[PDB]
Ligand binder design. Structure first.
Ligand code: 07K
Ligand code: 07K
Ligand code: CL
Ligand code: CL
Ligand code: NA
Ligand code: NA
Ligand code: NA
Ligand code: NA
Lengths: 407, 407
């Protein structure tokens, strides 16, 4: 099997509109969470969100927007960034050896609702002719494959909050097996009340910090009370190692492990044992120690703890366990975009020799007092191997391991 | 790479609620298309659909339905059928070597719309706590993986009308590469006005045959005027050959080729050249002649023709080209479910030594007069290798080739 490297990155996040902004937010523990006035107006319990701050119309032209919902428009921006970062020519983007696996946890719920409303108010014709590619689950792959003239693989994987970890992992497999030489991999999610209300209704989102929105997401805090929803996108350019070396690519890291398993247990709550099998699967092909864990940890009572137990089972407790820092405390949870964004955060930390604080821990949950949860940013540290978990509703687990390339 | 066989099938279709019913409809060219009174009431141009006729509550118990939209409920039925057909034990369904790749072209649009309506009329709490797993793009994999206690791979692929062909192909790869020994693969789609209107609004669906609904879908007819939308589901059980042989499995066929490519051209219209590359990819691993083509052909002016040209380019014209019969003329188009259902139709035709009529051709389009489009059912024919195309919006192409197992 061939070796596979990351040669370019792009991102739209609640903590920045490019990799430089995101790096600055990570370093300074600057929260991306703000008040969602619209949620309050509609009567939600949770009134916080992680909203990107980016001018779409300035970055994607009107005709290029015809088939984009907002999530996929953010994904288009991230794809332009990743192409520019990788320094790819048009021929390197558009060829039979180059594909795309790009997903979202849902399609444009906004498009679906607006369409139903306008059908009933003004008639079906007034939905307009461009709604299907926004509303279908493959929206992220379809829109980008068509616009960027992708000729190789083209489809979406979805797996809830695991979505873009599986997209990256499957794209890794395509290259390992020799089916493609370059892949664009990642995903996106719109941020819209028509999606967010589904989570508010299940009581899944934070509601006791509405008056201090910036600290509402607080993985590992004793008083965590649910996740904070976000939108955005991310893209990695992946290449077989020979392709990357021969063109003088930047190598942000090598993908050295991928795990994918299923709990077969509960729709919302993780089992823990599935996560253990997923991490062991990712680690089975890794020879070096892990220097940093980017957990799934979403700031929920029932979710943060089984993952910590799974980490304990594999790595042990205390100083022998890799440092753990939950980026969702700053970013919230962007569903389909989470996995790829967390890959990017981890690669940017590796590039810049620091591990961010696991933010907003005012009082550590005593269940986790034995674990190396990062309470203050760690500087001047050389990270060589990093592990990121994403887990999703339906007991779906994905883990990725990235390594600094040194030959 | 390991050999991979189909050991069980399940189906919910507009032309039958199990494989026996479906076989009878294929043999007798019995249309599954009927009047959609609701579409007429809402002011649609198209007033026809392909609706399954199946009593869900009699086949899936109430607690088991908690997280199902109607499409995934049909998918659950198809999964029960496929497990029963394969004769699998509980241990054979639930183990680390057994996974699920199960998709839909969209999630439950009904759930999304109902949720938005009830939020605005009665408040967010009244959405209830079970909406997310119905509304997310991974609904088919999440619900079934959780209920059937799947422990291996668990995710969805989506690619519009290519969805379940890619699900089967990726599951085939998992087994070929040795990552899993058994996979449940397929997909589903609900049938609901909140999805159908999106297609009516683009003018994509048949509207000139509303007074004769049974003949509205008519691939290759000179007067075809758009596709007819349908709902349903299908499931294949896939196994590595040694696993299948050792347990005395039924072998409905061996998967011997898979193609997946991208047009990189137009969002709605196929390019043709992408399809040629996809078929060549599927055929690159096939040594036998193709005895039957199950085309993508959806009964659209702009879609049926480029595929015919691509077939001509690969296979030639006239008698040297494999017989072509468009099952969508009977079934309509079930979006996420199409691929797997067409695999099942093709395997059932192979099992029963016949090729169905390509139905409702009152006047053949003269552009296709040189091609072996089946005008009357062909009996007493031994089919050994069959090819099925599914293509999707966003220029996404998938082709599967199945072969009668003879060693
Ligand atoms: C199995 C296991 C446990 C803890 C750490 C590991 C590592 N760093 C590489 C591979 N396997 C590992
Ligand atoms: C390339 C090509 C053209 C036509 C038929 C074929 C077949 N039956 C197997 C493999 N390749 C083929
Ligand atoms: Cl459950
Ligand atoms: Cl286009
Ligand atoms: Na309105
Ligand atoms: Na992570
Ligand atoms: Na109402
Ligand atoms: Na087909």
């Amino acid at each position: 099997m061939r070796r596979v490297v990351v040669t370019g990155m792009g991102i739209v996040s609640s903590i920045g509109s490019n990799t430089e902004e995101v790096t600055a937010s990570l370093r300074e523990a600057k929260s991306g969470i703000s008040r969602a006035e619209e949620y309050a107006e509609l009567g939600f319990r949770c009134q916080v969100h992680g909203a990107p701050d980016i001018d779409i119309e300035s970055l994607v032209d009107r005709r290029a927007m015809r088939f984009h919902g907002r999530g996929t428009a953010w994904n288009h921006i991230a794809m332009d960034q990743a192409i520019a970062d990788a320094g790819l020519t048009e021929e390197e983007v558009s060829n039979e050896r180059t594909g795309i696996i790009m997903g979202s946890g849902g399609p444009s719920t906004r498009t679906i609702v607006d369409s139903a409303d306008i059908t009933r108010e003004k008639g079906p014709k007034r939905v307009g002719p461009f709604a299907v590619p926004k509303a279908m689950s493959s929206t992220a792959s379809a829109t980008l494959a068509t616009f960027f003239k992708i000729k190789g693989i083209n489809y979406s994987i979805s797996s809830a909050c695991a979505t873009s970890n599986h997209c990256i992992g499957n794209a890794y497999e395509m290259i390992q097996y020799g089916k493609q030489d370059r892949m664009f991999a990642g995903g996106c999610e719109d941020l819209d009340w028509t999606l967010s209300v589904l989570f508010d209704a299940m009581g899944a989102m934070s509601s006791k910090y509405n008056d201090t929105p910036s600290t509402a997401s607080r993985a590992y805090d004793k008083n965590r009370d649910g996740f904070v929803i976000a939108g955005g996108a991310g893209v990695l350019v992946l290449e077989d190692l020979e392709t990357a070396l021969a063109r003088g690519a930047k190598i942000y890291g090598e993908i050295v492990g991928y795990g994918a398993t299923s709990d077969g247990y509960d729709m919302v709550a993780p089992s823990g044992e599935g996560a253990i099998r997923c991490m062991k699967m990712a680690l089975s092909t890794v020879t070096s120690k892990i220097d940093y864990i980017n957990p799934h940890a979403t700031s929920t009572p029932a979710g943060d703890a089984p993952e910590i137990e799974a980490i304990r089972q594999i790595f042990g407790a205390g100083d022998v366990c890799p440092p753990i820092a939950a980026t969702k405390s700053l970013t919230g949870h962007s569903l389909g975009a989470t996995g790829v964004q967390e890959a990017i955060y981890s690669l940017l930390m590796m590039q810049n020799n620091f591990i961010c604080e696991s933010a907003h821990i005012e009082e550590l949950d005593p269940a986790f007092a034995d674990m190396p949860i990062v309470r203050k940013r760690i500087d001047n540290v050389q990270l060589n191997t990093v592990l990121s978990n994403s887990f999703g509703f339906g007991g779906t687990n994905a883990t990725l391991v990235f390594q600094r390339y040194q030959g």
